Design a protein around this ligand. Structure first.
Ligand SMILES: COc1ccc(-c2snnc2-c2cc(Cl)c(O)cc2O)cc1
Ligand SMILES: COc1ccc(-c2snnc2-c2cc(Cl)c(O)cc2O)cc1
Ligand SMILES: [Mg+2]
Lengths: 209, 209
């Protein structure tokens, strides 16, 4: 009961561009993922203003960054609105076919990879640093699902068997071998202070034994 | 059947700050409003990917800028998802109480008024240039409503009697007397090219007789 899907051709092309393009300022992936968490936190915050029971699955709106040097993973957890199975399958809630088109044109009209979030498809910048990304998500009244892709044209979706998350999304980045700087506390703190210093939810960087 | 509402105190404070603070780079209002139109266009585009009938109220996703020097108005029209009456009353679909708090703190931690969109409340930058803003909006399956406010602590909502809009939002800025530069074609073109050159929907600047 793992379902395997092909990416639409425009999204496979976006992913190949991100993986194959020489581009040294990889650290923008974290700004993009923290931005998406902030947008998801804004959404549950706005829904709660009229229906407080929407927070029954967790009242605290925040972001956790969890490095694990043994697993070579950096995990970003938020307690935002979460995604339904349909939204995961439909490009993680993004307008990715049209966004990808505009981004390609921009890149011709001069833009650079760091502008990717202006085209609605910043999630895929994860592949600047990760060989595999796993997305575990829970929206109120839908079940918990895990999406995962090592690129190559396909992704899987299954019902998740992990720990329950309450509500929100967890992005687990399985880092490339040469990208382990992004597990180091000083490097993560530096990038958060540089690019996410005004995000309006607490961001807690976990430490390791 | 005009309903009059008080702004929550944090939003009245945000509006007073924007109106009373000396700050010369007013032109950022247009970037903020065009951004909100783009976000609303992204939303109907994403809903249409799974339900095409959502576009029965208009298939074209675009933004029009309409200056009128006789009325001293600059109007921004989009054919995005639109807002329900509830969303208009609840601060135009924004998390404005919490966004306002963060923005105030940022402004202390050094930030400037141009960063307002990072706090979810960029709409209110309209009051850098407008004495009165009128917001006319139509979401699928809700009626067309007009919101309006000259600040001073209150806004009104009524069912709109204007021309039907199909779907989307129209922001009519009734400009301050000293802010008429923003009706001039070269000035609007300059600001769109400077700050909204990569927005992914057509932006048509209307001309005047
Ligand atoms: C910008 O488009 C977006 C589309 C969808 C989302 C949503 S809705 N629920 N979770 C996420 C989310 C998705 C991702 Cl990929 C993530 O990294 C963190 C998240 O909380 C956010 C932004
Ligand atoms: C950033 O938060 C936002 C909150 C709500 C919206 C939405 S949903 N439908 N219309 C608008 C909209 C609202 C405004 Cl004010 C506008 O200028 C243009 C619009 O299309 C957009 C952004
Ligand atoms: Mg945004």
């Amino acid at each position: 009961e793992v379902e395997t899907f092909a990416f639409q051709a425009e999204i496979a092309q976006l992913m190949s561009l991100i993986i194959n393009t020489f581009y040294s300022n990889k650290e923008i992936f974290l700004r993009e993922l923290i931005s998406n968490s902030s947008d998801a936190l804004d959404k549950i915050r706005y829904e709660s203003l009229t229906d407080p029971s929407k927070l029954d699955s967790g009242k605290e709106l925040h972001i956790n960054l969890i490095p694990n040097k043994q697993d070579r993973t950096l995990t970003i957890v938020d307690t935002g609105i979460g995604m339904t199975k349909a939204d995961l399958i439909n490009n993680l809630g993004t307008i990715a076919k049209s966004g990808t088109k505009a981004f390609m044109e921009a890149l011709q009209a001069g833009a650079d990879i760091s502008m990717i979030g202006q085209f609605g498809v910043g999630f895929y910048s994860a592949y600047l640093v990760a060989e595999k990304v796993t997305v575990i998500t829970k929206h109120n009244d839908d079940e918990q699902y895990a999406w995962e892709s090592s690129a190559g044209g396909s992704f899987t979706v299954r019902t998740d068997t992990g720990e329950p998350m309450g509500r929100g999304t967890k992005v687990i980045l399985h880092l490339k071998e040469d990208q382990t700087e992004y597990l180091e506390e000083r490097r993560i703190k530096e990038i958060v202070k540089k690019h996410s210093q005004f995000i309006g939810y607490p961001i807690t960087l976990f430490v390791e034994k």
